Symmetry: C2
């Protein structure tokens, strides 16, 4: 089993990964807010929905059951 | 306002940021699952809770209202 020193090093790495996740989420949200479309038609809203489903599906495929919820956060933030 | 070409380039960048977010979430979850403690006492569970609150607080401070929910996903995944 892992020593306290090995657990130490892994907790340090999780700290740095949370920094990287937060950095990338901030960058994604800034870009999204800059580009998110103006007045939409129903046809245009349909194109957006299809893209959001792909993103939700991708997150589900990659990380499993929490994927949809994580994608949902990012989509809400990006408006 | 942004041209279709500028929006293009930004959508490409969001694709690549979702890849980086997913990569880091997978790495964080693998490390977390490898290190997450065995039998805990109540005192030990108290130390964990205090660490989880710091993480929740950090995510709230950095990204705002969705921070707690995002932290909650990562904590659930990491068990």
């Amino acid at each position: 089993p892992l020593s306290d020193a090995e657990i130490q090093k892994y907790r340090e790495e999780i700290n740095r990964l949370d920094r990287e996740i937060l950095d990338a989420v901030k960058r994604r949200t800034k870009i999204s807010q800059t580009i998110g479309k103006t007045r939409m038609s129903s046809g245009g809203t349909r194109l957006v929905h299809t893209r959001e489903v792909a993103i939700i599906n991708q997150f589900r495929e990659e990380i499993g059951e929490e994927g949809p919820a994580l994608a949902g956060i990012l989509l809400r933030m990006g408006r």
